[PDB]
Amino acid sequence: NISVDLETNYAELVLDVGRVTLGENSRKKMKDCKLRKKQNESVSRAMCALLNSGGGVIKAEIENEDYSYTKDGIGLDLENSFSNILLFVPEYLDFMQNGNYFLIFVKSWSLNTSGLRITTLSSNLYKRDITSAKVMNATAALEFLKDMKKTRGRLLAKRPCVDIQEENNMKALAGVFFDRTELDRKEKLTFTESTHVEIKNFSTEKLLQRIKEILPQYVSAFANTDGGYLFIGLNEDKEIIGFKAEMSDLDDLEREIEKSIRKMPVHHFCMEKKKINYSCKFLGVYDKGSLCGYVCALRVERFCCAVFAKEPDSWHVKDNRVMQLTRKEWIQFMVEAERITYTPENLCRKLFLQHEGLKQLICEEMDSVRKGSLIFSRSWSVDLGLQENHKVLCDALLISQDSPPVLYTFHMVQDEEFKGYSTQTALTLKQKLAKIGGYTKKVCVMTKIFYLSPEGMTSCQYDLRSQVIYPESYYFTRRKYLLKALFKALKRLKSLRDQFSFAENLYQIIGI
Amino acid sequence: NISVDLETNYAELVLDVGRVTLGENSRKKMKDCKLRKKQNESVSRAMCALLNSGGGVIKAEIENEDYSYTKDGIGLDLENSFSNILLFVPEYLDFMQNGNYFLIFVKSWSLNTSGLRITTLSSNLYKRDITSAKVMNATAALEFLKDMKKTRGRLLAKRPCVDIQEENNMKALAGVFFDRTELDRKEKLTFTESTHVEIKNFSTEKLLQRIKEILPQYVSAFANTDGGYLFIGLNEDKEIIGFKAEMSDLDDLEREIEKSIRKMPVHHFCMEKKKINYSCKFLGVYDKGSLCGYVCALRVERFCCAVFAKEPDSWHVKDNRVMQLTRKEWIQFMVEAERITYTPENLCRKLFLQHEGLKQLICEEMDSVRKGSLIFSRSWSVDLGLQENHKVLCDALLISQDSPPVLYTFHMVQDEEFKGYSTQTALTLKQKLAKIGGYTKKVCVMTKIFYLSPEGMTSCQYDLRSQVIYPESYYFTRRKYLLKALFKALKRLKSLRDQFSFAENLYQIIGI
Amino acid sequence: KPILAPEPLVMDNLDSIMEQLNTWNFPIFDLVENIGRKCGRILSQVSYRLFEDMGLFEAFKIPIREFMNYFHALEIGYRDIPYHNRIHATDVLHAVWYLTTQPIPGLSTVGYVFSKTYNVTDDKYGCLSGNIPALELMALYVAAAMHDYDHPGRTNAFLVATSAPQAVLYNDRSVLENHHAAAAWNLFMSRPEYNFLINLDHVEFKHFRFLVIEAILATDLKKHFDFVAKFNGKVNDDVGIDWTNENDRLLVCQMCIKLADINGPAKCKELHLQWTDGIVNEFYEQGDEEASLGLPISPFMDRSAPQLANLQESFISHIVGPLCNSYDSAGLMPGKWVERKIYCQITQHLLQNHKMWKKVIEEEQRLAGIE
Amino acid sequence: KPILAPEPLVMDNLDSIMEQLNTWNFPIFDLVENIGRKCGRILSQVSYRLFEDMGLFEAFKIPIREFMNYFHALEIGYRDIPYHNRIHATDVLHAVWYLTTQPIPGLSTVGYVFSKTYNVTDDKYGCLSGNIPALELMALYVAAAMHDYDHPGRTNAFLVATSAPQAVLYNDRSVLENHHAAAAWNLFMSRPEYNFLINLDHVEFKHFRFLVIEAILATDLKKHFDFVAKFNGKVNDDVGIDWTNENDRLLVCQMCIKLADINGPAKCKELHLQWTDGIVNEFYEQGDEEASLGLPISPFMDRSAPQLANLQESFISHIVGPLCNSYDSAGLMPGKWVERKIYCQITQHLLQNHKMWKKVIEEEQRLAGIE
Ligand SMILES: [C][C]N([C][C])C1=[C][C]=C(C2=N[N]C(=O)[C][C]2[C])[C]=C1N([O])=O
Ligand SMILES: [C][C]N([C][C])C1=[C][C]=C(C2=N[N]C(=O)[C][C]2[C])[C]=C1N([O])=O
Ligand SMILES: [Mg+2]
Ligand SMILES: [Mg+2]
Ligand SMILES: [Mn+2]
Numbered sequence A, B: 001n002i003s004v005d006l007e008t009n010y011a012e013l014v015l016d017v018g019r020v021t022l023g024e025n026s027r028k029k030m031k032d033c034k035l036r037k038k039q040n041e042s043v044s045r046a047m048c049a050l051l052n053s054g055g056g057v058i059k060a061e062i063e064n065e066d067y068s069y070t071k072d073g074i075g076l077d078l079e080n081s082f083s084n085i086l087l088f089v090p091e092y093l094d095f096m097q098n099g100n101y102f103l104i105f106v107k108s109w110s111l112n113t114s115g116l117r118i119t120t121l122s123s124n125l126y127k128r129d130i131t132s133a134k135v136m137n138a139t140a141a142l143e144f145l146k147d148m149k150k151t152r153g154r155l156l157a158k159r160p161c162v163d164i165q166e167e168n169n170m171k172a173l174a175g176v177f178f179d180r181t182e183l184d185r186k187e188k189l190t191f192t193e194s195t196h197v198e199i200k201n202f203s204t205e206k207l208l209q210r211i212k213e214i215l216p217q218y219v220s221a222f223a224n225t226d227g228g229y230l231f232i233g234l235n236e237d238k239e240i241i242g243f244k245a246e247m248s249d250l251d252d253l254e255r256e257i258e259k260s261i262r263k264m265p266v267h268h269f270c271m272e273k274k275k276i277n278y279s280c281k282f283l284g285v286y287d288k289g290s291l292c293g294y295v296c297a298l299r300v301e302r303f304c305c306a307v308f309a310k311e312p313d314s315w316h317v318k319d320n321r322v323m324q325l326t327r328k329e330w331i332q333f334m335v336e337a338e339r340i341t342y343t344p345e346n347l348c349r350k351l352f353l354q355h356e357g358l359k360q361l362i363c364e365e366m367d368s369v370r371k372g373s374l375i376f377s378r379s380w381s382v383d384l385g386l387q388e389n390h391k392v393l394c395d396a397l398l399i400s401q402d403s404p405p406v407l408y409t410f411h412m413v414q415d416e417e418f419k420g421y422s423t424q425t426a427l428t429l430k431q432k433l434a435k436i437g438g439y440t441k442k443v444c445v446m447t448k449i450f451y452l453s454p455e456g457m458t459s460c461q462y463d464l465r466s467q468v469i470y471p472e473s474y475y476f477t478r479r480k481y482l483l484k485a486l487f488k489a490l491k492r493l494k495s496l497r498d499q500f501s502f503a504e505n506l507y508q509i510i511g512i
Numbered sequence C, D: 001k002p003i004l005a006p007e008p009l010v011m012d013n014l015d016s017i018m019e020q021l022n023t024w025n026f027p028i029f030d031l032v033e034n035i036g037r038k039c040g041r042i043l044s045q046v047s048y049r050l051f052e053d054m055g056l057f058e059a060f061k062i063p064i065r066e067f068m069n070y071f072h073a074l075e076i077g078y079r080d081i082p083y084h085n086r087i088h089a090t091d092v093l094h095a096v097w098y099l100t101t102q103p104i105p106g107l108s109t110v111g112y113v114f115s116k117t118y119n120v121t122d123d124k125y126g127c128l129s130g131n132i133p134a135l136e137l138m139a140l141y142v143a144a145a146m147h148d149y150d151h152p153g154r155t156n157a158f159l160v161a162t163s164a165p166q167a168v169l170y171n172d173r174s175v176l177e178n179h180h181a182a183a184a185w186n187l188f189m190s191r192p193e194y195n196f197l198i199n200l201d202h203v204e205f206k207h208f209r210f211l212v213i214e215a216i217l218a219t220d221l222k223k224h225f226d227f228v229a230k231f232n233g234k235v236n237d238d239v240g241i242d243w244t245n246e247n248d249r250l251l252v253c254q255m256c257i258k259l260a261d262i263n264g265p266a267k268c269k270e271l272h273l274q275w276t277d278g279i280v281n282e283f284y285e286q287g288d289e290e291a292s293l294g295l296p297i298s299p300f301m302d303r304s305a306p307q308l309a310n311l312q313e314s315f316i317s318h319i320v321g322p323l324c325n326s327y328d329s330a331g332l333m334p335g336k337w338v339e340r341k342i343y344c345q346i347t348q349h350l351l352q353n354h355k356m357w358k359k360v361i362e363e364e365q366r367l368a369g370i371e
């Protein structure tokens, strides 16, 4: 239920997440917890998609009335989700209540010391923290996947006769308990939970519902850490209780368990693909010579590679659609590493000689700039990998320290509007600077459209800066870092020919 | 209250943490929560010290009686602490109930994809997660410190006239509220908590106690993120209540705040050292023309470098003492990057010719080894950086795939015992292999001591393997990786002369 | 005095034995006996056969007369030393041709030139000729022909230690390889009759010269571990080998020529033993010269106390072994599918030779211990 | 025909001007005028003065006669080309001496050799002579004396493009630097009368030769950015520069000789203008030769359309600028404490010259735009 807003004036991806309740008191008093969780999930998915797609804006309609951002705030759950996604919220997120809408400006995710290339809401990889199954965080999942990739996946020793107790004792006792043909009610176990033992108690009515939900995560945790045994039908005090069921109920439960396990995504880093090796058994419980119920024992063998409880919860924006990253793409991202200067001189001279009014317009525009660089191109859209527009005479990109980058589009057609072309070019330029360029600060690109009359009259048809508003952090940029990011992006896009005035003469003499 | 056990037979650092209650039910039913927290803290400190000091054993006396590890377990709080310290508990920790003691075998911390060089219980660096002050985890602290180190630390822009609300509005409102000479009781604020605003309500009796406790973390969070304002004396509904106090009480509170702020550790990455810029103000609250109480407003300016609420909680073992890492050492660790083969041939030939029984003893010992490498030295203690023992004839290190490394000590003195020397040498060798060598798997070193009679009689005075017991994971080692780690450790210790039989002749011919 | 090739450019009596140019264990010494040691036309004839098989004569419009003249002059340049003679050059050229042209299991293929002994219809095999441009392949073949030109029979260490004029000229930096490349290119540019690349443009000639020089300089064993480490780092990368990158193709060609220069241990028993005998004879001559000059005798170069088995075992385990392992792990090693597993003759021969040398060393040690 | 030095090894008439050897802006051209262009004894006398100041004559028991003979032969070897003559060699030797010996603010000091113009009592200053061994310093000085020996007045690109014999000999890999080092060492080893290092053992002589060759080869501008990047990576490391490491000391010496080779823009206005005039005269001669040969005229080498200001501005902003910035950031730049801030004459002179060239370029552009 997240759609890309195509009617916005911003030169960036704007994701509309629908009506969202905002404010700490307003959100904590929401009667429908399902709606609150759905709104939180939508906002988190939009934020993850923008982080993975070069940054943008999340636009949310303020559902609650009489909401003031200064007086009410955002909401504890939303802030917790943002903190989970991002280590430093102020470095990436900006908040703005514009009229009836709430805008979250999200900077693109940048590679850092952690080594993460993308952001994930939940990797859905589980491990065993001695007794608990926990979903690996981004760093833990990264380490696990890289270790498995590096190694293409993943008898007894004589010891002194000393009476010791280890986890192997619990595992052996659980294995012996697994092979028992029948069980006696109200008997105590000789083992407890460990890295290889999990014990849960479920009601008969909720057993089928919870098998589809909690079994995948425990199976993933066992297959990821060391395998183990899951016992269903034992209370807190390790007393055998079981659940009452018929033979048909046992068959249906076994089928549901098989379907749930086979539904679990699996990624293999080895040459020999393997299935999840599991064994499901039902042990009858006899009380006073009569069958009380059944205990479900599931033995999960150690798996060679990654086992997912669900598909990894990572999102991005492709073809103006918010799409969840496929398992293969997510794995590839995780495990695989990565005055005023007028250039180029020849193109600037040609443009100024062919069109006299263009030079005057450029001088008038640049008289208000303290220091910066202006780069001309026949079509900046082509250099960014988009389709060429032959009606546009030329494009100019201005990079200055006191102002955000500005793209100047010039056209000779009086009765045609080039707002969409310029907006798309600016959006693509911002995305390339953020991701390919390597720029690690908040950046926005403004657009200015001019009509060049044959008689030399110049008019500013469209000025983006006067129609959109950004947080102040977006209005101050680092000129040197912007130029470096632009150079890197142009080099990686195979469109770097003469944009930067390097001393070719000097390097040619030297031989570099 | 953690001491290094010098009476143990293990060839590793054994830390005694005193009596510890174990078992899930036993620990959850402990009447004294202070004692339980103290035991958890001691175990965590010992584990961190062993992780930072090359691994070892934590020995804890089982306080509760009739405790069985297989039947009872460990304890939820201890497992949570271990999970917080270590991403993958089974990779580093082994548990063994030996008689009346509980042994936690801890592997040394190894550099991984996360980039962490040491383990920290709590970095004590706080940041602002929109409304909350949270202690930076290891990855967040690493990123923050590296970013500050790289940069040697850390006006208005014209925008369209659009009625918008941002965090700057809350900051400005809080600043205006800060400068108010007097306040009116039961009036509502125009702002709420944000990245720069924190609002807390404290009782008069607990105010002095909580100033020494919670003020440092909020001050650290503000100085680390963007500065801000802390307001004490406002209830949940943002109504001005205040606390009743006298002028002497205000002076004492101001002195306590100043002492608490000046006590906070500060590390500077810049050339110009600076203090924490803070301003404390007391605003009177007037109700019906009478002074009700006072509101404490603390403005913390943005700080240039790291601000600590307390010293970073990282530990290690030095000079057989468990010492907390100093702030400088912790910062340096965080921000600054890093058949049978008989060698050497000449030394082996000399030892075999000088002592005839030594060759027979070596052959008898190695007849039971399928494949491995035996390295002889005049004194393996010297090669590890320790003091030389002239009474020891020679030392031999055996590396085999089916057995853990074994150090063979040979002596000609019948009436003297070399158990301590051999144990210390094995401990140092294990530590060097784990940390300097780069070995990333669980490793233990056994010792065997032999007496070489002048007539050629050989007797095994001490056999470590028959007297100590390890988890099975320690009895299987990777021979190639062990040899690589030993080579790296010897190279970094400037004691690599002829231990490995490289083809010097071939390299000399080639010229390498 | 231009060294012009003999008037018959093609020798018909060899046409039978050239039919065995498609197998790794090429009986090169039988070809030397058939042609004759006096004339020394082996390298020219083998190069002509390989160029005809590739078709580089028609691809680049290479004149036959100039090509034959220059390769005959190159043959004359090689000295009659036990190992680094024209026979070694012919062997290295045949080995690079075999590595580039023969089918490689699982190698995907993308002007380009294919050998006449390769089956393009089959889709389960590939060849390096289908991923490396024809100009680069010709550069690799020419460099292999030039890899050890004008070799003095002495190692780099001997020249550096004795302060030989060649060592002083190149400042003790890859003396042998620099000398070989410089002498080969000086011979090529000395006479107009040796210019078989007249049909190449100025830029193509410069690129060809750069590739040939890089490939020749890659044959130095002092930088062997550097090349091995660089190749392993490039292969272990998730990107892998990129055949659209000039640097990756240059590295692949350098690895091919390096592997072909030390292919002797990877052959059958007879060829390996003959090459070992030649190299140890050269070592013995060098050691005799060292003894005459008064310098200490280098290891393995003492005729009085031979260590041939130790030298061969060390060379296989340290130099040839890791290089072959890296080349096979990259996936460029020729082989066949066995029915799915891959069978490589080169790796099997290397393992057999290493086992033979280990057995010889163990027997010698046992005999010494008995006495 | 050995080129023996003149019988008077020490010239007394120069003793006054040598007193100004302790300042960066050494009037070298006045010394050339005083000595005389015919004899060309400037480099020998300056080297003798510097060696006496260091005391390397007594430290290594260096014979005076052999040293003077070899340095006179080295002077004779330098050709009378506008820039790369013996005057440039003397300037580079003086610059390396100044960089190594003069006080450096904040440089901690650890046989070793100290200059007679350095105050060891003060603890607020340091010198590179206190952290670099005497053998390495002597190697650096000798390499600076040998850095551009037998220079033909042409760039590497010109030699490569024209297929000069020197380019073919060194396979288009650092032709000029390899030629300089090889010719210097061949001259050193040609005559027994030039052997002033007879008192060094075999290992020390080999290490000295290696250091000299590395320093000479570091002067190539084609690898300038490689050295700059390596030095920046080493300095930005938390470990920093380790003076107990041989590789770090070698890199420091290479950086010193590289900075001294292009020290011209870092001098006063008069010396900078004279060196610029010399280098542009050499460029004009090279461009005339290119026009005669029919090749396109290289940039900045067209006498008809000079671009001296553009060339100097580009050279300062791209080559000298980053190198000086890296050297100063490492902390090895000489300077003085101002009362605490550090004042460096070299950096100030470089900034002033860059501003002068920018002003000249702006004036020329304005004049062109007016017309
Ligand atoms: C000249 C290169 N080299 C001498 C250092 C050398 C040449 C040939 C062989 C060689 N040995 N065994 C064979 O089977 C034939 C060739 C490959 C080995 C070496 N080497 O490094 O010792
Ligand atoms: C031969 C090196 N080089 C030509 C490529 C060169 C030499 C000298 C100078 C030079 N220019 N300005 C001066 O002031 C004197 C010297 C440093 C510049 C260059 N160069 O790279 O163009
Ligand atoms: Mg060779
Ligand atoms: Mg030079
Ligand atoms: Mn060869």
Ligand SMILES: [Mn+2]
Pocket: D147, D148, D219, D261
């Ligand atoms: Mn020079």
Ligand SMILES: [Zn+2]
Pocket: A153, A267, A268, A269, A270, A272, A273, A274, A304, A305
């Ligand atoms: Zn698998």
Ligand SMILES: [Zn+2]
Pocket: B153, B267, B268, B269, B270, B272, B273, B274, B304, B305
């Ligand atoms: Zn600071």
